[model samples]
Target chain A: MNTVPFTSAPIEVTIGIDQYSFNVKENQPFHGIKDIPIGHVHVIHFQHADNSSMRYGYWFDCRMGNFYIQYDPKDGLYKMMEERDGAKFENIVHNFKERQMMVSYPKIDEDDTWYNLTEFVQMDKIRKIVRKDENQFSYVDSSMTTVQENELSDPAHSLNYTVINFKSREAIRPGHEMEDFLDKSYYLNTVMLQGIFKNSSNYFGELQFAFLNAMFFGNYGSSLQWHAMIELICSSATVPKHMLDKLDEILYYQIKTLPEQYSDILLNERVWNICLYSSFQKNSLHNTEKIMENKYPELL
Target chain B: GAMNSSNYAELFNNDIKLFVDDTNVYRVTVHKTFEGNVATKAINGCIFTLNPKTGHLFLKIIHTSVWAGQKRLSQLAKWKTAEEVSALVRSLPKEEQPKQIIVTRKAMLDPLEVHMLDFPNIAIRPTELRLPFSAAMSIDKLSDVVMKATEPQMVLFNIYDDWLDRISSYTAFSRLTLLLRALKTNEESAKMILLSDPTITIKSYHLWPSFTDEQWITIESQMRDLILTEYGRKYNV
Candidate 1:
């Protein structure tokens, strides 16, 4: 339902073979993939927003958070807009015209509240992933590409990008279904495991951790370490060597008494997501079903 | 001491008094007095004594409260029998029964009792002649006492099951602390206390309103262990 007059700019993105798109009206998740394709390309096409059609390009600024480039179909030119991150609903204050965007926050207890997005500053001119053909791609910030007026519309025509706007609402909803598959003890055990990992993040560098937070929470839930840990469990396209060591440490001490089968089941982002969502559903008075039905809605 | 249980209610055969003997066999005397506009007089109370050899408790009531009942002080008059005293003592929680006894006795001095010959300094500075001699049992203090006590002891405390349940009393914290403190001190010796129901179940203890029963269990279980570890970190000259 078009509850608000101005809605979020719908962004259609493709990560490798995976395809997903987000729209406030559609209650879609911005990033729905299970594992974060760290060094992959994402081709994003911004849909009609208030009838203004545009194409958008996104890249993971591991140097920082996420940055977006807007392709104004009318101007026939692509301009890097600004770097933005997800923020808490209550913590946001609307100011500065250039710093805000209409975003949606779907809540179970009440109809979604539209918020103005916040985070980061304008990075002069928009830069493109240059060198190698539109079919070939290289890492960002290489001597291949520099900030300048770009006539091209496809940033991901190459490879490796980050769709930052509205990441998975995985931040807002605590997965509760984990208990069904993993049993009731899953919630507490999961929390205990995450709590243990939070202290030991030094095993992975700060950049990787920050990237996970940005990728999963849209930077909105960086402090939501428990939920982010769920994202971390899922981020293992191929489990990092250090992650395995860390998981072993956790199983040895925290989950020492837990059955080998149960501990083994604790290893995925998919069930972890459902488990956390189920937890939030059980504990909250909100319309959990409504919230859980959609992976991505408007969220800070 | 050998007997599992014994009663000496007949000692206060005519009068109504209550007596309770602790695990370590510490004896305590409890006396209640009535103060009215018309007159002030002794009401009723109990005294607890233990046989060193038999370990039999002599629970006796010397006097009974006159207002024991409007329908009858006699209603509770039947409360004076040996059976009554035995049941009364036996009715106590098994956990609380065999613990140390804490006595609260407040004393005041009369001006006539003081003299320059006995205290020349008092004559010169009457205001400075203050005696601080009262203590309201507190949990922290109780923990301290438990850490130091050599053996289990008994306390002559006025506590009821109702108070322990709702724990609404302003002094509830102090009372519970006193009980816990006495419990640990007693446990430190040889064994724990004895009550009719030693399980020590409580619905709520207002002393710590924020803790849930689960949280309380955690705190309660580790309370003594924590005391021991922290206790070892210090030394005395």
Candidate 2:
């Protein structure tokens, strides 16, 4: 799989559906399994009633929290007709259809409720970002200040983003848990982010994306950690590897162009901290000393 | 030796005349002689009787070698005291005794070790946990199944004798008794008695009016199921 170069600007693309509002645009299709361009983002439009209440909810890949939106009927109808199903059906058919319509569109009013589904996007080839007009939204950016501001001002948004990042870290690092949300997010967006890229292929269609999310983060990535550890042991390395070689390939591609976009130094620092704090190393050293004292008195 | 014999005869005759005066003493003697070409043989025998007043008994033996014949006799005799005789009789060795003895205490009443040979399938553990009394239900079910499988004239429950001592606490034993009673009264079931911890021999007739292999199997299956179920759930758990 080719690693597509990262892009700085959002791609101006339109997906038409009639039943929902699409304020956030972080989900976009790409070619390579890794190296998603910066402009690529998914724009979610949710079908809603005339009263501006959410009519349907759409879940992104997996780690991306669910995006909820409410759309005006006129705009929803116009967008739905543009997306091809409008000519066949005069109006919304079912709740699922409304949800599908929202997924197809990316425009909505200001008061419309919008949620990010970037965490749900699972492939390296497909990177999704939320945007308004043409600039990227503060919620989709990886800036620490942005994250801190959002977390402090809006706890719900903070929680959704924190949980997604926390789950992501668990997938990549496997057995590590951060003491706090900020630390977890930092660890996840840094070290564990590679996991999101490693599992970005679509061998079995879009369902594989859901499988990847479930396998990596459904149980908060505990399953992925176990799997990675098992794979490391089976490979017979001198030191058990945490992330597989495939992940490293993805990381190499990601760092080549997206190095500024991601936090590599922070990821390396987190891993070093884990190695230093691991109980296994301490216990092994203690056992070695004990053996020397008892069995090898001359050495002591 | 001839002079010594004549003196002993005179003494014996005087002693007898003193014990009973005017009693007649009779003596009988017989002599035989054998002649060969170069040797001659002679033999003599004598018997005497004394008065009845003197209660005395005497015995004597003699052997002689003639010119061409020789004779040898070895004699052992002893006069023992009452204590000595009794001791000799008691000192004689006796035979060893058998390891197991078959003692018949009553008619058809014998102590035999009953080995548990086989058991039929039955529910031992209750599927439901809320019912503590469900253990008895399993046992009852087992008994019913066995009854249905085999139609016997009589089925006697030969429970471990020790169970009788603690039957009050043992629900299984009580349940078995109830089942046995039901079977005995019911026209459909063979007459059977559930005997628990019995020291006395339980006759087949007393347990079951009629005995058959089918009835035996039924009872045996019930017993096995009850024991296994109770043991597995209570002790094993």
Candidate 3:
């Protein structure tokens, strides 16, 4: 059957001229690797004025913690960028399949109309995706829309519907026992958007183990944020004393080593200022701030 | 000095008795031991037993207290000294040697779970014609990969590329494909050891193969891109 879908944030809203209410799956328990919910996929059935029903699906991804949707009718893809003061869902359109992604910022012109200042980003220029040694990589399906042969099992009640029907192939080698085992495509497609999004900030980009652990273990939900962290950090909640002591150890390590580490990476003035206030508020750097301002004027 | 002396004392005092008891409990007749000049710190006082279940072999290292725990090949040098690990495997008779070693880590030991990320757990192959250790997969890597359970989990694999002594790409390719399929499909992980690098006799896991013909192609392409392009060229091996 022919179908349509849109990428959106996790918010309840009405859709189409009929004003059908759009809802999403929320607070589902973690089942397995396949069962980890990344974002929301909301499918609803709407009855047209002609008395015919059609299924519409919305792919709700929490890409940014907060953002509004910009739908480009030309390419049929939605760009959810940061919300600005005056701009509300501007009819800004760009090529979706192009190598460069369109980035828009706001500007006020002589007529006081906000111009959606457009910029294109060539991401490969900044970073390249290559496999690491002893590593395996898989592309979680980013495109939310899909077509299927079989009919969906009543989209009205079953909100969680399978979008992609990509199946595992036959055994690589003939006569190999257990050939039909690795077909996780069905489950993988279910959690496609989320598998890539969750638990990114916990590890501060090749920082010390002490620092990573502190950052990871600090917030309770952030510790068990995603399937990765849940699977990785399986340590059961311990006594508050142990948690406090671990926190103390981590805090102490950061207090002594953070400034030195910050000097190396915190090159921008605003970032250094933010770090100064954010980190030093908890870990007082009264004795070290002068040394930093004098020693690293580039940072101050 | 006294550390070696006490280790020997325990080797002589308790390891043999424990081995005999475990063999009876397991009902396996054949076993072997290394002592004195042959033993390394981790492998010392270690007794090997082949627990043949139906047809497959399960090699157990029995000793007093805790036997040497499993470690990644990357950490083998730091943990038990790489040479020591290799030497022990080399010392085993062809009939008794394990084709694969399963390295396991306790859950509470690493609350941070750093070991989960270090995978395709490597095995150092000794330069020998027979009974070389082909694969050493980690237990925790597989467990943490999917579900967040307090119980232990594992990652299984055969030998990946190493600089000094490497296995045949034919053998490596076949086994690695199977292991990756098994992991992705959530099949009996031990089925990986049931083929290619089995003990003296050949055995099968009697389960359906992990991937379909089409799925295997996708997996194989990914493997080629990752293993060949990213990993193989990095070390120029």
Candidate 4:
């Protein structure tokens, strides 16, 4: 990536996505480019009306904090389409008149590096491993494969997304992670273990903060700190090595090894998928399930 | 010795005779677990009221909720005590009343204040920010020597538990750093051993984490240790 001009006018610096940080970019607001840092699966922030929202994560105005996981482009698009169909997504536009809601994809390919369908086939194995049971619910499409072009609920919604896959790993398959049964987002809302340890109402935000604290700020990190993290996330042990150590190293290491650890989590997802389904089911008002039921009666 | 017992499914029914005694030495613990990935921060207290005379090991459990009566669903939760054992104990037979209630935590827990109490027949073990477990022992069983600690000491506690159960808080590390900063006044004559809980008998804690153990283990893999005064790289003149 080369340093390019973001604005025609000369600017000094602008605020970063972090609530309180900035960078010298000649003079332009840090609109994080679709510059995808190649890594493991991660939750990507989607904007209203727009396919991808690069505005700011953790804290954006009136943003419901809706998100989706992106391991590669294929899964990302799947989330956008699924969420739009469910009416759970909303994009914001504010200027001269008032703050209004916009709809659909960002419609710009500047940020994405595309992957064709043949590559998606590589994801079929692991995709089935995790997605096989999704059919039991009322939402989602059980089949792994989804088409590229089609009519979105609102025809104007630009519905394009990027897909990524690796030639490695034990499980591989072609599919956007959607369930025809459970009838919900592959981006689950259910709580996981590490979040409980945060002692905060917003664990996800806190997680981003903790990571930045180590990777960015110099908090004089320690193994006791890292070890404590392992125990809470992995149920393990450790000691303070030497004296001070940068915590980012440990944070990345743990994050990098996620595919392995993910399989280790023994709490059966079926319980919560079924359990939460009952709650939503009881509240007829929150019926994406009803919508999915009508669209795909054959699956039912 | 990591307590890997799987019999905790029927935790109350099982033999915790090792952790509690039905007689005068009764135990008071507030459990914090996961329901979905959300922490039950333990708001509702599940009280098992047993009659003093009828105490042939009979247990009666009552589950309550968010409002007074109009119920929604599920068990007790949140960051407050579900029900006051002290209040219940007062309403019980004087003989059945507990002599002392010790509040214990699995990690260097910060939520003990919200879960259990210190007044009346209650005592928060680690009396002052005391984590019940030593470096190796489960909070249920702390060594007498560790329990008898009176003088100031640096505690490098274990905050690991069944994170796969559903976690979100990794601030345990950051929280403890502030704790160490506040406690280590003189930084002399102190013994600090790394506390690691190997037991699977999970109970309660202060915060939580959303990531898995493998992720954490990977991060901790990059450590350089040796009597690290620990922040030894930088110090005062």
The TM-scores, one per candidate, come to 0.19, 0.19, 0.21, 0.19
Could you say which candidate leads in DockQ?
Answer: 3
Estimate the lDDT of model 3: 0.26
B84-132 per-residue lDDT for model 3 (tens digits): 2233444556554433332222211121111211211222111111111
Task: Provide the global lDDT of candidate 2 against the true structure.
Answer: 0.25
The superposed Cα distance between candidate 1 and the true structure at residue B40, in angstroms, equals: 60
Q: DockQ for the candidate 4 complex?
A: 0.01
Model 1, residue B152: distance off in Å is: 30
TM-score of chain B of each: 0.22, 0.18, 0.25, 0.23
Instruction: Give the least accurate 10-residue stretch of model 1 chain A, judged by summed lDDT.
Output: A113-122
- TM-score, structure 1 vs. true: 0.19
> In terms of docking quality, how is candidate 1 classified?
incorrect
Between the candidate structures 1 and 3, which one is better when assessed by lDDT? 1
On lDDT, the stronger of 3 and 4 is 3
